[PDB]
Amino acid sequence: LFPALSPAPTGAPADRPALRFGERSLTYAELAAAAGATAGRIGRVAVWATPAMETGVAVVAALLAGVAAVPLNPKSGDKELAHILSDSAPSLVLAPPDAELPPALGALERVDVDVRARGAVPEDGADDGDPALVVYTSGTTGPPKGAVIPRRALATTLDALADAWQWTGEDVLVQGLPLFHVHGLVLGILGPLRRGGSVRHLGRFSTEGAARELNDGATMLFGVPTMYHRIAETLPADPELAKALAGARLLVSGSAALPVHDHERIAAATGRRVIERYGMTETLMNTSVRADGEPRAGTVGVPLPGVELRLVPIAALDGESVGEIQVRGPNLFTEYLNRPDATAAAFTEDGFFRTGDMAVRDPDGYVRIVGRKATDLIKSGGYKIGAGEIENALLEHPEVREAAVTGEPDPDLGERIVAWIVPADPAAPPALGTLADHVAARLAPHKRPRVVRYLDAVPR
């Protein structure tokens, strides 16, 4: 999976940079040795997945050990952690030494991840179908399902992207994405390691931080559309940001659609374009605009090598016939953990995954996502948010009789979460702050409502 880490590297390859988090870093040899020491201490494991160097070491340790990792959002609330802990039943939690863990984890064995530890890299005994990660992803109803992602899916999607993006071990990625989802963790940490390159993780994203790294040897930027919106807003005032983007080898957006107004403001300011790629937790990456392809706003390009894609079948490349994307390939997840009926429902009889995403293809083969088959989802900041679980949390509040949750457009977030409340007392309805704080404390801050509306009645 990482031939530059296992077996332990030697000579010049060993002293190449691997991970950089501000002034903290690890070379390939240092990462292999620190992850190896950790791997020997874990013969499923949870990872307290802060946007910090320890998270890279922890996940690489699990992969070297051949033990599935379950990334935890360090801002998850009590309900959300209890569910993941009960569902995935990890043996231990890998955490940074100084992390304050919440009481939901009080009974779990804590293994501190030491980035200065030096141990042997375990022998690789893993099989390609072995679970690599369990990544919790929201559905339209109920609590998040654990997508079990096999080792082979990681290798194949990362190598497919290497071909599409002309990504090599000479590339230096900058990113500031969360490390408990696929974009930040798989593409943004494991991808550079599989390639033999490096990543500079910003901790918290900022336009200034992205500019700094791209003006100082970073060659690629990955972000969600919200980050590109904030870049587009800042460009007129920020000459060094404009130069940073103009000089980049590749700018990539994903997790949600990049609006054409943001695309074109970036092109106006910098003279170059942002590649979009389309993927899902359950499928990893499906399509991308290629580095050697024509840049086309509002598209997600062509199927990646090894991905079988169809629209439903619609065979005309007409830019007009709307159909459901379905995919098959070694990029696919194994199952939803403990959910065999939901797993079976996600697949056609002949083994294609039903994405729910609606698309056309143009005469060049390019895919444009234009909607949904039956059921909108909510994407806020490039997080997929499930309405039903936000409703279920709001219903716990004593000032809420009934609740419905929807998304509405937001120029910065793509969509913002709306809470529709039948109050306990219509003359004293619960304020947004009380409801938002409650959902943040139960679920996670990114899932909080940003708007509240009161009604007499909501769907049952």
Ligand X SMILES: Nc1ncnc2c1ncn2[C@@H]1O[C@H](COP(=O)(O)O)[C@@H](O)[C@H]1O
255 near ligand X (CB under 6 A):
yes
- Letter for the amino acid at 39? A
Answer with the entry of ligand X, Mg ion, ligand MCA, none that 300 interacts with (C-beta below 5 to 8 A by kind).
Answer: ligand X
Helix locations, 223-311, DSSP H: 225-234, 239-247, 260-270
> Which tokens in the block code for residue 363?
């005469």
Nearest to ligand MCA by Cβ — which residue? 381
How many other CB atoms are there within 10 angstroms of residue 7's CB atom?
A: 13
Q: First CA to last CA across the chain, in angstroms? A: 48
Answer with the entry of Cl ion, ligand MCA, Mg ion, none that 52 interacts with (C-beta below 5 to 8 A by kind).
Answer: Cl ion
List Cβ neighbours of 19 (8 Å cut-off, separation of 6 or more): 25, 26, 31, 53, 56, 57, 189, 198, 199, 201
List Cβ neighbours of 11 (8 Å cut-off, separation of 6 or more): none
Answer with the entry of ligand X, Mg ion, Cl ion, none that 281 interacts with (C-beta below 5 to 8 A by kind).
Answer: ligand X
Minimum CB–partner distance for residue 385 and ligand MCA (Å) = 10
* 384 annotated as belonging to a binding site for a ligand: yes
**x/- site string to ligand MCA, residues 257 to 296, per CB under 6 A?**
----------------------xxx---------------
Which residue among 254, 323, 356, 414 contacts ligand MCA (CB under 6 A)?
254
44 near ligand MCA (CB under 6 A):
no
List Cβ neighbours of 92 (8 Å cut-off, separation of 6 or more): 42, 45, 46, 108, 109, 110, 111
Given the structure tokens 């996670």, which residue do they identify?
Answer: 444
State CA 332 to chain mean position distance: 15
> Which tokens in the block code for residue 171?
């590339």
300 near ligand X (CB under 6 A):
yes
Minimum CB–partner distance for residue 423 and ligand MCA (Å) = 26
Please, which residue, 66 or 188, has the CB nearer to Cl ion?
188
Minimum CB–partner distance for residue 378 and ligand X (Å) = 10
443 near ligand X (CB under 6 A):
no
Region binding ligand X by CB under 6 A among candidate stretches 3-11, 65-73, 122-130, 248-256: 248-256
Which residue among 38, 76, 207, 226 contacts ligand MCA (CB under 6 A)?
226
281 near ligand X (CB under 6 A):
yes
* 364 annotated as belonging to a binding site for a ligand: no
CA distance 423 to 204: 36
| Bond before 7 cis per omega within 30 degrees | yes
- Establish how many alpha carbons lie within 13 A of residue 274's alpha carbon, considering only the half-sphere containing its beta carbon: 32
* 255 annotated as belonging to a binding site for a ligand: yes
CA distance 91 to 44: 6
CA distance 18 to 38: 17
Answer with the entry of Cl ion, Mg ion, ligand X, none that 53 interacts with (C-beta below 5 to 8 A by kind).
Answer: Cl ion
Which pairing describes strands 353-361 and 323-328: parallel, antiparallel, or unpaired? antiparallel
Contact 397, 438 (CB under 8 A): yes
Contact 54, 96 (CB under 8 A): yes
* 24 annotated as belonging to a binding site for a ligand: no
450 near Cl ion (CB under 5 A):
no
Question: What kind and span of H or E run contains 79?
Answer: helix 78-88
CA distance 6 to 227: 34
Which residue among 257, 302, 307, 403 contacts ligand X (CB under 6 A)?
257
309 near ligand X (CB under 6 A):
no
407 near ligand MCA (CB under 6 A):
no
**Contact positions vs ligand X (CB under 6 A):** 137, 254-257, 276-281, 300, 355, 357, 369, 384
**Contact positions vs ligand MCA (CB under 6 A):** 177-178, 181-184, 205, 224, 226-227, 254-255, 279-281, 381-384, 446
**Contact positions vs Cl ion (CB under 5 A):** 21, 52-53, 75, 444-446
Binding-site annotation: residue ranges for malonyl-CoA? 183, 230, 255, 277, 379, 381-382, 450
**Contact positions vs Mg ion (CB under 5 A):** 387
Binding-site annotation: residue ranges for AMP? 255, 276-277, 279, 281, 357, 379, 384
